[PDB]
Design a protein around this ligand. Structure first.
Ligand SMILES: CCCn1cnc2c1c(=O)n(CCCCC(C)=O)c(=O)n2C
Ligand SMILES: CCCn1cnc2c1c(=O)n(CCCCC(C)=O)c(=O)n2C
Ligand SMILES: CCCn1cnc2c1c(=O)n(CCCCC(C)=O)c(=O)n2C
Length: 570
């Protein structure tokens, strides 16, 4: 017989609650911005403006009582805790000694990071991406980058997810020594220093919380009060659409690998592995972990770091210790968690790790069979070729011979086949290796015809510097160009070459190029033909599948050719 409660929607955070508390309007340390609770804190204000209020309230979700407390006046705030994400019809009842009166039901949301409160994501994929029916057991992976939402304007709902089995989210940094990040300029280091305030060294953090969970995406149905927004809320809604798609955070990458060189100390590994466990319990849409340490032994961005005696065994120990932790999560959740790693494939990188030992702990190795040549120097070559190119010298392919100064080659050439063969020779099983495809070109200026030793092959020339171009042409950093920019501005509709560029293909290497003989611009990349050759290769060797770097740079053609090539190999 009291008055039925009316729910104050605006005073109850629009009935949006969450197991994860996320700061939405600042940028601070990771431990200050992100706190995961086993029970969501619920606070609901209700009013009884007319008649009597009664003395007690009960709260129901879907008919089931979840809380009770005192009413002592005409406005009451009910505070309680609840453990399970999703959407529930809430009713609040006010009671006196004579009876109870229930409010009309209203939907409350309790966010959780598995996306249990979310509908399947609405997609907006470029229709140049075709449908395939590739065997679900073949890996078809790609990297999606956190910063691609900015100038590149490529968001989670643009991914052709039905053509993927694995999405690797690039990149999760590690707090600690990170000089390599400073050298890249822009805000990357300042963002990391901010994220790491109040965080122990060697723990993972989110690099850009605005892209990860603050930015409101209208296509995802985000509102002011939505407790999780950003790329991460869209990836959660994507798992509701595609529950078998594996979404895996990639830790490190070329500029964020400096802290790994301190993993020779096991206490730093222990700190890192515990931070990864907490991260996967905080962000439950993730299905494992991908380690992108570039590179054990060195030769990467940190010129002053790298230990070829100890980094190998440390990498192996880290995989073993991650697999231990992941087994604990599997035991706790009843889920399967995957452990993978993207690795360098030059002989001088592979020689520093016993991968047959490491891979026993791992589901897949993503062989980075790209970046073999590029604008960091003026020597052209195929950056992602399967085999040795026509431009190579006698003895250069297998490392038997000498360079132009007569100095012995130190090891076999940088090609995808040389890397895969070295890894098989160590005893890595073929069915754990994933072959990489580039959705980008690398390139140079100044490779003009007077510099060539073979007049029909620009790979025999000499550059003056890195390729330059505008972001309108897909050039986001000197020396690199999106595949879709090569296609729009250099190849043209017919693949015969436009804007002063001509197309060529080195059939021995399985590698395309475009070359502008007057500016000397020369770009090495992957195309439909070379990607079919890679798929025929992967199928011949019984590799696990193919993956690509990075998805925003494709227009459909490369991912289509990945599926075609895997269907089509002979
Ligand atoms: C986490 C979401 C709640 N939340 C939302 N915005 C927040 C917080 C928060 O908790 N802290 C400080 C945390 C106290 C010290 C610690 C060990 O974390 C903040 O500064 N900001 C801006
Ligand atoms: C804005 C995109 C430029 N951009 C180009 N390359 C980039 C970035 C970038 O931003 N971040 C992350 C740091 C966060 C910076 C910010 C504005 O919050 C990166 O790691 N890389 C490699
Ligand atoms: C962010 C990465 C791009 N990047 C920026 N500077 C670079 C690279 C790069 O990729 N490689 C090739 C690594 C060798 C890989 C192999 C086949 O072993 C480089 O040598 N330098 C100087």
């Amino acid at each position: 017989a009291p008055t039925a409660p009316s729910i104050d929607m605006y005073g109850s955070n629009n009935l949006q609650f969450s197991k994860i508390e996320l700061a939405m309007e600042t940028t601070s340390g990771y431990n200050d911005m992100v706190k995961y609770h086993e029970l969501a804190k619920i606070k609901v204000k209700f009013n009884q403006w007319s008649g009597t209020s009664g003395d007690t309230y009960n709260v129901y979700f879907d008919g089931v009582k979840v809380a009770t407390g005192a009413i002592t006046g005409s406005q009451t705030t009910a505070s309680f805790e609840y453990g399970q994400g999703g959407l529930y019809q809430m009713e609040i009842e006010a009671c006196d000694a004579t009876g109870c009166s229930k409010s009309a039901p209203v939907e409350i949301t309790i966010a959780d990071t598995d996306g249990s409160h979310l509908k399947p994501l609405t997609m907006n994929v470029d229709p140049n991406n075709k449908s395939y029916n590739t065997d679900p057991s073949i890996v078809m992976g790609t990297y999606f980058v956190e910063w691609g939402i900015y100038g590149r304007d490529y968001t989670v709902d643009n991914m052709p997810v039905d053509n993927l089995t694995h999405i690797l989210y690039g990149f999760i940094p590690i707090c600690g020594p990170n000089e390599s990040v400073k050298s890249v300029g822009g805000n990357s280091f300042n963002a990391l220093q901010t994220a790491c305030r109040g965080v122990n060294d060697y723990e993972v953090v989110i690099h850009d919380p605005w892209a990860a969970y603050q930015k409101s995406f209208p296509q995802a149905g985000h509102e002011y009060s939505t407790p999780i927004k950003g790329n991460y809320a869209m990836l959660m809604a994507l798992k509701q659409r595609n529950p078998d798609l594996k979404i895996i955070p990639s830790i490190g990458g070329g500029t964020l690998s400096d802290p790994f060189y301190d993993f020779v100390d096991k206490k730093n590994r222990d700190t890192f592995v515990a931070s990864v466990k907490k991260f996967l319990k905080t962000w439950k849409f993730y299905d494992g972990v991908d380690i992108d340490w570039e590179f054990p032994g060195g030769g990467g961005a940190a010129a002053d770091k790298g230990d070829p005696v100890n980094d190998g065994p440390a990498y192996i120990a880290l995989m073993r210790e991650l697999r231990v932790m992941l087994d604990e999560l599997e035991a706790e959740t009843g889920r399967t968690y995957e452990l993978t790693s993207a690795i360098g494939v030059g002989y001088d990188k592979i020689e520093d790790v016993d991968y047959a030992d490491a891979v026993q702990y791992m589901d897949y190795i993503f062989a980075m069979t790209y970046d073999f040549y590029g604008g960091w120097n003026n020597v052209p070559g195929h950056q992602t070729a399967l085999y040795c190119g026509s431009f190579m010298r006698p003895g250069q392919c297998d490392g038997g011979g000498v360079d132009e100064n007569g100095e012995p080659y130190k090891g076999p050439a940088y090609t995808a086949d040389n890397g895969i063969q070295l890894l098989l020779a160590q005893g890595v099983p073929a069915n754990k290796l994933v072959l990489g495809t580039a959705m980008y070109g690398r390139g140079w200026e100044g490779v003009t015809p007077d510099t060539l030793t073979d007049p029909n092959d620009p790979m025999t020339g000499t550059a003056t510097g890195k390729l330059k171009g505008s972001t309108a042409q897909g050039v986001w950093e000197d020396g690199v160009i999106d595949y879709k920019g090569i296609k729009s501005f250099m190849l043209g509709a017919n693949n015969t070459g436009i804007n002063g560029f001509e197309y060529g293909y080195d059939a021995q290497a399985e590698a395309p190029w475009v070359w502008n003989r007057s500016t000397g611009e020369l770009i090495t990349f992957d195309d439909h033909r070379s990607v079919l050759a890679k798929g025929n290769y992967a199928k011949s060797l019984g590799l696990a599948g193919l993956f690509s770097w990075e998805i925003d740079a494709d227009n459909g053609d490369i991912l289509n050719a990945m599926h075609e090539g895997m269907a089509g190999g002979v």
